[PDB]
Every structure is written in C-alpha cells, then in structure tokens.
Amino acid sequence: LKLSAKDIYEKDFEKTMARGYRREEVDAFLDDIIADYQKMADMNNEVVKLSEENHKLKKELEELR
C-alpha cells in the first residue's frame, strides 16, 4: 500500500476560490476511507482467524455427519 490511515488524516490540499471541491464533502469521504484503511491493516489477520474458524466448524460438522 502507498498510503496509511495516518497519511490520509495528515494530508492537506491547497485551497482556492476557483471552483474547488467542498472541503467538508471531501473530508467526510476521506474519513470513511480512513476507517477502511484501518480495516485493510487488520485484514490479513482477520482472513487467518476466519479460515481457522472455517476449518474448526467444518471438522465439527463432518464428525457429526
């Protein structure tokens, strides 16, 4: 990944009166992206936990026929 949740929080753009984007619209959308990056950071571990649970649940099933 080129960015972190932190880099996106830290980022600042140049302001303008010349038909720039609404700042609060941009910052609200980037806050949703910040959340998503947090989740991206934990995702590999969450895939691992979920596949281990996947496996445990499948063993239990086969054992119960």
Partner: peptide, 7 residues
C-alpha cells in the same frame, strides 16, 4: 477524523 479538524 478530518471533518472536525478546524473550528
């Protein structure tokens, strides 16, 4: 959270 980061 950058929506609340000014004023």
């Amino acid at each position: 959270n950058r929506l609340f980061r000014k004023r």
